[model samples]
Target chain A: NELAQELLRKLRQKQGNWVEWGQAIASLQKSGYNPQDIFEATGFEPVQQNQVIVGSQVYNSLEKSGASAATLAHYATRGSDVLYELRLLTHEERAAAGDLTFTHKVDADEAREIAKAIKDFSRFRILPEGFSNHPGDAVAYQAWKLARQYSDLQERSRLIARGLRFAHSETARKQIEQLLVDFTVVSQRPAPIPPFFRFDTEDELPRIVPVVGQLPLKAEELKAVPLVEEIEPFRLVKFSGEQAWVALPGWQVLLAAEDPVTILATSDRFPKQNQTEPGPVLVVVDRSQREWNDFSYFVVDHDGELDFQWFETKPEFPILGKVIILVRPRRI
Target chain B: NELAQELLRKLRQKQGNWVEWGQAIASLQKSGYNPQDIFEATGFEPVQQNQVIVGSQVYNSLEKSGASAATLAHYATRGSDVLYELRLLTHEERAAAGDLTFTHKVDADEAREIAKAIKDFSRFRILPEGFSNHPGDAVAYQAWKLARQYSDLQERSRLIARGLRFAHSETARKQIEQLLVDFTVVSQRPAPIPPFFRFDTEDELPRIVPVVGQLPLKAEELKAVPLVEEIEPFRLVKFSGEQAWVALPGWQVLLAAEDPVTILATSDRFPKQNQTEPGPVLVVVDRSQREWNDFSYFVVDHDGELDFQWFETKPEFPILGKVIILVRPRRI
Candidate 1:
């Protein structure tokens, strides 16, 4: 669309200096300048303007009177058409302005001061640093070490029980075989450190009692203490021929009296069982000390208490932080 | 190992239950049950008081203490060996006590209340009150729809640029082309955003501005006038020889003069070259409005004497928002 190419060609031949001038005009437009304003402000008259000189031949061919027809045509068509195109290109559709784009600037002195301050504030420490070089790195390394030790202990014990030494000695070998049976009943392996904290504000450094080995007579303990209170809200009940039961407050009873009883399982029993899953149902029962001596008191309540026993075989590993519990009312 | 096994077997069978009964008797050599202390005060010591039920073969074996020296030697060697083996399975090692292990006990009422609340709360927000479906699922679907709409706009502009018959005239075609470029810059490519908001509340909001576009001028407007006092902090310079010389501030050399010489390889003569990196420099030059026939001037720096030309491109795009000049001291 070089409609005025032939006219520009004639003008260049007549005045070669006009070529650089036209190119300069084009360059100014590219650098965000308006050509019409430039010509008007410079006082270039209507007929003698640079655009009129370039488009004169075309305007003369199209005009009918003193006012050239091409000029009229430009006002009616090309003039408005080109301006509209330029407006859209230079304004609406040229670039994207977003809330995120950086439209702010600062002087050199302010920027230098800010950079220096950032470098100095990164040296303060808060927590006790561990074995690794950095605080964050030490925390990760310590966690990994504890995890590895726990798994190793479990593997070694399993292998020792299944070894050839178990079948070698008659009396001694029998004792090892018996120990395996007791191990299976005991179920739970030792856990990694439980998170408990001691306060420095008080003079008394109350010792944190580590989780003791699972008491083999879990049912008997429940049966011995069988009253429900808010502070100690757990009770075990056993009918003459019914499966033993432990119930907490505010639970619905679905089964008939003849139906098998259900035990109340709470995360409070997290000491006796893992609380990762939903709290379970349990049944508790009392048994004679002689039965416990044979490690057979567990047999009577086996069916009702199997899941809790299964939980004893697995333990969760948590980092060094105390459990924080908060409760709200249950709606509908 | 088999020789050790053989010795243990012989010693155990030779003593049998007879040695077990004899040891029980030997254990009470220096003690007698006091009826007043044991039975009346605490409880009866029934096992220790009446446990002399030795059978016929067992009673005859320990009846004559000097039955055989060989038998005594077997007992001495085997008894010490058994004790050593028993020590290996101490409570400390088996229970993982004394080393690190964890135990936790939760108060029963608190645990029950917490679990019940969690289960209840899970039901409330699972589906919002008015909505028929899960709110989380609904939000996810809406986010996916917004992403599709953004991509569609880009695609429509691109198709029109590829010579698709858009049913638009030449003016419309040019408008569409501008839109495509703007969309490309904004959607597909964009500049990084600056972190806004001041850190120190005590300090005043220092006037900082970002310079976006360039202004043009001739040597006349650059001259200082008495009215220039109003634009005290504002400045203007001319790029001549190897530096942008400070022309308006008398002979006061601007800090930009100390910066390295920049060569802008632009098509326009004003800034014939542009450095690839930002220099600690800017020259406030007046844009030549005489070059444009249909534009208005935005006078930015108007002191009472010296007038500064506000070189603006698109009147719709305000110069104030995107362009700012920061005034601060030069850093080292």
Candidate 2:
């Protein structure tokens, strides 16, 4: 009888709570209320406890809303599946690349050629013309964009491949796939993207473009030029948590994923990190085999301003050809 | 007008949805239904957005009840004000000790003496007469427990001061006040209590005990035990999330003065990299830490026996500490 009374009282209280709750839920769905705003308005308070009394109906409602036991069960299973697949994929790719050698046989001319190809494939040749104006460049643009999304080595490979598949770019699909295979085979993480090559739309000044070929516009020194002035879309080298820095056949740019912000910075003198300078600091180390090896080692020190930096240490090695970018946290 | 019509249609649909939802909710309150089961019956799916939906009245109710926001907030912040006050009082006691380092200076002999004093106060001394029955050994037990709780240097000081306060046997009023302080100052974090601890049962753990001349258990061990076994009387840690590893602690330990479904992990092992593992690894890192350092880590070896490791790095240091005791992987 005591249990019965207690149950009756609880049931009555729950009935009332449910009435209010159901009305509120209905109001929200009807009004298209933002869930976050609703939470804010509720002024909900938390109480610490070890046990809780909840109704079966509430549980069922949650299940119907895609939180069912089976759904949870599936998530539980799927999460493991994806993680497992990712691990296997990474390992298999590394195995095919052979040993973990950081040395590449490409010469400066060859590197420049490869960089140019990446820029072309990356659609670095199209931003000046605007993306909407060049539907043919979308594939390259997407490939470039995805290259800048994933931060982890293994995850990046998957994302790159996934993006290529999404873009339906057979060339990019093959190239990125091969890249993943090589990275996995070598058991090496992606080289950090160098800073000079990132997207930049913020500076009041213009961007700088390095001369890759014997073109008439080739300046004797690096100079800041507007990214919009270029004919080719910029090529993205690497992506950190929130920033994407890219390079074109003739220009370098910096882009923030949020704010749709952009900046342009470059120097014919090679963006050196000066200790007394306000901009990014460059640390230079000579790791070339010969005095005339012509390769210079430089590290960009952007301080806290550069939230992220990705250095590309693969594809080209020894004189590590890479890119770096900045990151901004989102409100979520 | 077309948009308005669409919105109206949606509103009507929502009303229908609410009718169905209310019936289930009422049944749950009346019959004590599991919310998960109810949700399944309703065909609702959980949106993976981290923020609570403002419009979700049901989620709001649950957030304040059995789900996450309420539970985790309690675990993080509940009792903070009381704990702060208690810490102040404890500081006063420490100042009276004439030296902050006194607890450290108290050698094994002194420690043992303190333990003896604690045992005397509890009137639970290790004696031959009670050997067959519940041995009255208290100080030794207390000391052993305290040692396991505080791994950091500064934390040791806090624990020792607390133990000394316990040994000062006082009247009931003073004892209760001190217990209140103890609950607040130390063990503010939601510490796990043994399952046997209950509030509704007659055998509820006593919060206030008279100070005795000596602790019946080891002072060091007892110092490490959480000040309160239960914060919200009958609440137990309720586990929820897609992956079994992700759970939310009950409300009563929040810092933000609100409750949200606090994701938690029940195992010390990391999640398996593959679905082939026996079960979903129930390991999640604390949200307070940056970069999910408090979350679980999973990796797979060449043969693919998933290596799961769960740990959170100490906030003050670079090392990870194990929070969960069990690691069970359900083999899929």
Candidate 3:
């Protein structure tokens, strides 16, 4: 009785909401109301499930209005079979009979395609769970999934399908992506960062070493080389979850730094270093220093309380600061 | 020799001036420069007056470039039998030969029609008297006359003929009208006015007079008739160039006004008794005064200097204000 009342209310309130009308009739039948009684009470003769409802009256009217025989045949074959008894009529035939109503005018092939699409759409069973009771939500879900799958097709075909299913493709791509983020499983990773080194020394008087060893004898050649102190004013240091090694200028001597201290302990001159925990830090480095080649490294740890220890044996110099800049991760 | 020199100067200064080139060649031939000598000197061969010039090279070029046979045939018939010689070519055919110049892609029929129109137009004889020496002016005159005659035909045919003769239909209508105004003889007249009357006296001291008399009266009807001063504040009066008769509360008086004041003299108290010349004027009259009836006439020349005189005998009433409004005469 509740189902019948709901069906009656929907039939009275919604004159042209076809999906709702179909669903309500379906519910009424499930509630055990005699189909004849329901039709008599609500004045809506429901079309069978998975069937396109083109009435004989509508067919006759279209025929009278000069619709081609082929067009009539196309409409007739869209569903299971042509039923002559009470059934649904298109808005065009209804408007032709009386008041002006919204109508779609298409050729025979297109008309048949549309009718078949409607019948198939109504029969669609694979919808997002919990949206079965919501006709609008089901349609939206189907459109999003179908558009995501079929967006690569020709734009006209996509738009036609969208129009048939009451979907707009303009935002469908973004909407589907958002839905994937919301409802689907995906793997994500942090944005990549290029390796960098931070210098510890502030004033000059540091020893210079070369990656390729040679005996330096000339005082003039040393005078011609600009001081490392005057070369770079600041250098940018970056920290991922991993620790990085540092080397003296020219990378002749290498030093291994411990975990959290890896980035922070290397650069005290970085403007952001004094605040809270260590993260990626940028500091100035001298560019004129010949000792710091592409493989050179330095440390400028200002915190005297930090524990610093050097390796026992002279470690072979590994190229450091070869990577230029670090990129930040994107938030989804 | 002088004409050839002028033509040579024009050709050198304006390389693409086909008309000047054609005219110069014609002048060169008339001046007894051998045709071959002129072509060798100016590098511009002359086509016969009514012929279209198509070179073998252009024909071969079009064929090599894959122009359809139909398109080639269409071009061939566009002038007097395509003359395959070292003669001057139309800009259209010249353009079509090299890199598909801007040739009109008309069908054979239209092309033939255009060519015939060109031939016939060159042979046109009727023109404004002194314009025969001025080709441009002569063409303009012929177009004005012919467009006036043939504008009634299809506009496309008219425009095609216009193109053949180098005329524009956009201004043809106005040009023809201007010619008509300039060349034709005509007579003109002033705008006419209507006839009206004005009353002499102020209020109800006058006796009623009827244009047509009867002897029936009801006692109650006489009591209900309003006094003259109470009847209306003012009555509309109009003036035709001729005489008019009016009745007062009814006046059957036969009035004959004087010259200039002929309308005013018919009634005693018209304000314009001392004007110099007759002109358009306006006035008001009373319906109740017994002196001004269907036979009464009045003139209220606001200009106060209207010339005046009386008529020989009372003229019969002429229709008044038959002229509604003055209309300005059209220029052409």
Candidate 4:
């Protein structure tokens, strides 16, 4: 935590950090500048001020709760995003979640889920079979329990896989894994999480200034696409299984992709050969389009692995994704 | 491309494309807010103002020329970086390069090379054999000519490959291709180019506000590392063959990665298998470390293709890179 004297001093000189900036912002509030007044004086938006101010408080609480030095160090360099997600967590839970987050390298979206799981699971008296008191395992148990009642088996498998992702131990994974026989189901992707922009820094890439909306990605064209939030703040994007919610340089093709997920390639599973290169592969797949085309390969979940051993005949196994761009990074 | 009337209006409301913003920025200067004064009143850093101010001029020049509508459409939405590179080119050359860039998807770095090649080639009275007047072919000719005189074959190959990248026609490629044997030599990667940030946009990811340094990436630790420009403005990164010059979440490990690149995986070239996945592969390689340690395959340039067909024995071929991480994007 910084002193009132330093924060006040930093307000003039600038270029500190999110924690210092938030502390300084609150200090300015003490200096008779309300959120809007301070915004006019400085360029920081109003809601952004609150995000940092509250985010800093959450961070400070974690620091006081004896979180590890490594976790503290991680937040010191990065922005106040994961800490922002932990705002709803109790101080005690924040401490546990902070360490878990640092260990797992959990991005904000997963951290949000972790916080929500912990919050909802706290109300329960008895745990499910083969589930634990651990927050990660709690998420697995909750997801699996809901999956059991889900009418849509595809949604059910998606939840089970999501649960499998959070399970800390083999016991929880085995229990969750047992719910379905080797399946990679395509479901709706999670909400797009924005990249963290430093409060004290302006980068060469477009700044992801904290605000509601200013730049519209064709105010009309984005109507069909739910939120323009993905492109509102320019960002280099990452894609997970069937998750193509964000934008990139190839964002045009990405935006057109219905339900995209990235899968690793192994020659044992995919015996196809291209003359250009040979290494580990990353296959971009649109999981929503699982039509059995005449001959082109479709990624199938074979014995709990992403397999591409398909030929002209369709296999009886659960189809996962239709191969889009088998992105083989070639030398240019 | 935008009128002064609309540009002025955009400045007040504050949400438009880079071209509009640039037109608006220059208009602010016309209204007597000098670059320095404008920066003080509004947060457009002085140099960033000039980059756009000048960038917009280059773009307008191209638009005035009979350049294609598609090229105009691409720059209308994106930032001013590529247009800024074309600033040095003659009006007619800019028009030609603009279409070439749009057709080839030429990034800023390559665009910079294209501009430089066009400018330098203009001075020559006679063109080289099998070389064309086309800017791309000029670059290939210049590169191959340099490669022939180069003492260090690695540097020679690097220059030759650099030239080969720009060759638009088969004649120039064949001429440049014959300069070197089927070998991929390890050499220094190109300069790290910063991501373009839209002047009118505030993204969810950090904005790459154009300017010189403010945030220091540990001024001391980055001593051996030439430029902090990579991470100075936050950017999601892309790595070409052995080009690990940019910053990513895996940046720290990337920093330690000497001469890193990314390569594609074809099963025939790399006859290996893990049971996890089967698809196109992307392999990250460190070209600097090519020691044949007892076993574990090294990427050798064999027959103009990136090959990984080594066993427990060493080979006599030119080693391109040491397989670091075969980055296979997996489902979580």
Candidate 5:
């Protein structure tokens, strides 16, 4: 308390010169006098005591050591408002202000340590919570505050880890890691993967005939010589229980057997339910034909023998130049 | 010759210290001793005598006056290579070398003028003809060289103007302006401008009927009860000689007279060329009808008389709730 009072007396004498006042305060603080006591002796308001104390300490150290007036003023004002601001001053600035001194000249090792602490304190501020009442020595507290101010997440984490090592505060280290993990989980949420394959009949089938050839024929002309081809032909089994016809080489026709015959005509002109004797007949059938369905045929008169055999079971359908056509037989 | 040898003897005594030796050489040069005579007196190699002389002079001047070893070495090496380099030292560097004495300070300004001459002499080497023997004072030559050294065209021009004022070299200034004009002409060649508006039919006419209600009809359905309307009806003059029809409110139609009667239809069915008496008819016509074209119409047999009158001259067609339709009667 006596040392604090002496510091305050000296501070008053040099009040207009912040550099002298700051050094006096620093010496008093270093000698174990509470900064609040020094502030009280100097007549600073209670709320602003910490600021005046720290500001006076920093200013005096920089000024007596030959720092430029501009540089000295910057740190003094910043330190007054926030102790953390004092930590923000660069190593070069600190060394210039006599804060990084050992004997008469700069000590490289001490300068490096102070630099590391400043870097750490910036990153430590990045944590969403905790660290406000962080439990550690003054060096550690200052380092943690500086670490929290780092903008880059990865750089912040590295500096915080270094701060924790230097601080030896296990509680702070664990809380920092928890904060990192919480942020990482939210940032790394999994993105949805789209299905690679799809199933639908609407998928476009390649046109066998070119568009220019189809353009010349009228609707009436197309009916006489219809062009037919399968759509989605590779997956025909999916159409089971549907009626279809296959045309073999030389215009011989094969119908799916389960279908009921609607018309059997020797010529293109034919009536339903009335037929002449079989002579090169073209058959129309209802759809409902399955691959395993049975087939039956009886000839009224065989004017010309049919060249191809009819089967009830699945037949080895002629593959070359074969075309399949769909039919509807099921009643709704 | 006797005076030059005396200067050389003094230079040797201060040979190890270049700054003193350089001053001694300068004094001898000032006193009307030729550089070659001094070189011969000193036994220095003819080719390297100038370099040695200049270097020794500069080195002595910088060292005795307390220049840093680094600064001294820089001037010494440069001066030996070319006397022009001695003029390149900044004022601060000269002050450091103790060259900023009241008497010596102004010598630098004079040295700079001489430097300009040396710089010009090298560049004038590009002349197709000889100027090696051009007679002029050293100051004039240096000022001319420095004026030429200004690479920025505008800066070079200003410097040459100043040089003319100082040196009275009218020939040099005019040549410089000519050079600038030649460069400016090449750089300022004019660029061609692109044409602004083009005349083409690719400009689309706006659709008169909003497309929303028209979507449900097939091409065949649309052909039967076609919902026809003019495209860009505001600019009808642009469609001169084109056939078009306007609908009257009572289900009657007015057709462009020049158009052939391709279709004459009742509410249900239609016919070409020969038509029955008008019961409920819809007529189709082409759009190229111009306002200047006179019109005429005749009825075959009217079950009901048409309500609207026709005009041979420009007539104000009934504008209220009227829809115009374009039609093509040419055989496909």
Candidate 6:
């Protein structure tokens, strides 16, 4: 009664959080009770109960690495999910992670990224130049590695500059910046032409637009694109509103209209609300489509700061276009 | 000089346009000679030889469909490549495609799209409501079908309106517009949550930004995300000039900077030259990044029209942000 009662009191404590509650849950598990049993006794979902139990074991192992009292106290009431992500890490890593988590305030997602980067970093054939063995430098290493693939001096330098902005240690930042030195242009010989002439250059073809209400109606006829010539091929158009559609930059999409433009779904001016708030969407607009439709979203020039306005009309205003294609976002 | 000499002269004729050359090449191929032999004898590339030969056969089949003399004359000197794309079509389809090519000035790429659409349309269980059996209506059907997927009334109406604008037949346009008659809202049941809590909401979490350069350096610490709270999340940035990089909208990209905004790779005002001009690129900019690095690309507002300028400084005339992430275009 004393042992079970003591464990239950700790589990039911008013100040329950990840760390202390994890220990109590872990103790009860050691005494031959499963997560389902814990779930029956307490309201913690079985999956959540498992997270705290495993997290407590990681916490216990972290203590062996001499984590400080402040670090210990910080975890005592929070970060069980963060600890659960540490299940793949080594004992020394847990200690280091706890210290970093306490010092840096790592959330569960970041913890997962850190663990993955560290694991991936260890398996690499060679480390990026100037990057340290520390986990913080892993993301910098990622930036370094990606930057190297680009032959463009401006692009490679920009990537390295980004890595420099996020390098954990000054040395890592210094090493990352070392890559930006000369960025001189490099040239290579062109490959031999293949026997078959691939029409890969098809995208470069000026799209054949049709007069209003003249879309080609047959498949055999479609084996190609133009009627009306598109003076301006396409532009990026942005829409932040409630709409539903999928994404892509396909050719058929371009041939459908006379003058096509893309809308940047995510722009500086666009306020990207959380996924819970409607949707973050992308839109494709047709500029030449000026004849008003009662049910259409138009990009009217609101003093040059463009926005996607749905179903609004005054008269002969400089209406940029009507939205033709769209991309709606989603998550579970 | 009489045996194969006449055939050779026909093939060797200097006025070698598609229709005449196609007939000559088709005759040579029918005489048990391969493209290689013809390639050796004539200057035409073997694949090109094949295009004319096949195209001539399609041209021959097309004549049976009562094509006009002007339509026949248009193909006489040009459009062999367009005809080669008609190899997938039926006798009737070739007739229709050639007519469209004449009437609508369809190029080779448009031919390919038409063939593909026709092929795809045949397999559909039912033609979209009001869309006819004609190939021209297929694209409108496409717009109609895609619009149907959108439950949003405005989006659906916009799609139907687009279809109406491109409808080849008035009946198809009239039938397609029927979809917009009444778009009443429909409600649905929400699915029950699973036992495990997925951390999908993590994207909504404010990114932890480091001051100047304080990136995390360890594997364990890597398991989570934050230091400075990002006031504004990411955005789409567009670069018109020459640069090279790959693409994606990933999380690590957001975590790297403090206040992020996107530059639209394509915009109405942006002069999108041919793909041969260089790259059609995307960019990520950090708005709060004012401390300029000599090598980085920064977004500057010139008379309210924003653009990405590299390695230029004029005492911070509204530098929007330093380019953090970039996406470059590619084609072999």
Best by lDDT: 4
- Candidate 6 structure quality by residue, lDDT tens digits, A258-287: 665544343211222334432334455677
Error of 3 at A28 (Å): 37
TM-score of 6: 0.26
lDDT of each: 0.26, 0.27, 0.31, 0.57, 0.35, 0.56
Task: Give me the runs in candidate 4 sitting further than 4 Å from their true place.
Answer: A1-332, B1-9, B12-14, B181-332
Candidate 2: fnat, from 0 to 1? 0.00
Model 1 agreement with the true structure over A218-312: per-residue lDDT tens digits: 43433433222111001111122212211112111211111212223333332222234422223222212111221111223332222221111
Error of 5 at B332 (Å): 99
For B1-332, candidate 6 gives per-residue lDDT tens digits of 36455666767664666777877777777787777888777777887887887788788868987666788888878888888777756667677667766766778987776665554454433565566656767656766666766776577877787677556888788767767775544443222221111223454322212111111123222112122221111223222222212122234656566665444343211222234432234455677786665555566553333444444234445565676754443344
Segments of candidate 6 deviating more than 4 angstroms: A13-17, A124-127, A147-162, A165-171, A178-332, B1-332
lDDT of 2 by residue, A76-179 (tens): 32222111211211232211111110012223333222222222242222242323212123433444445555445656666565445433335545555554
DockQ of the two-chain complex in candidate 2:
0.01
* Chain B TM, cand. 1: 0.13
Residue B44 displacement in candidate 2 (angstroms): 67
lDDT of 6: 0.56
Between 2 and 5, whose lDDT is larger?
5
Which one is best on DockQ?
6
For candidate 4, give the lDDT of residue B56: 86
Cα lDDT tens digits for candidate 4, A220-318: 321222222332111222222221121122334444666555444333233425353234344555666777754455655533333443444454556
Q: DockQ numbers for every candidate?
A: 0.01, 0.01, 0.00, 0.01, 0.00, 0.03
CAPRI-style class, candidate 2? incorrect
Give candidate 4's error at residue A2 in angstroms. Answer: 99
lDDT of 5 by residue, B174-287 (tens): 444454554332222221121111112432211111111111122232223333433221211112221222212111233232232222223212122224331323333322
Task: Identify the CAPRI category of the predicted complex in candidate 4.
Answer: incorrect
- Tell me which of candidates 2 and 3 scores higher on TM-score: 2
* lDDT string, candidate 5, A72-106, tens digits: 45555343443223432433344342332222233
Worst 10 residues of 1 chain B by lDDT: B94-103
Off by over 4 Å in 5: A1-7, A10-14, A27-40, A45-53, A56-69, A73-79, A82-84, A88-332, B1-332
**Model 4, range B209-274, lDDT digits (tens) per residue?**
111111111223212222223221122222222111211223343446655554444332343344
Could you give candidate 3's per-residue lDDT for residues A132-188 as a string of tens digits? 312223334455544444334454345435433433243433444454334332332
lDDT of 2 by residue, B1-332 (tens): 35433333443344443323333344343564344543444443322110112112222332343333433243232221211111111122212221211323343334334433332223222332212111112332243245335555555545444544433233322333343234333222332211111112321121111111111122232222222122121111221221111111211222221211111222212232335533212222122232324343322121222222322333332322222222232222
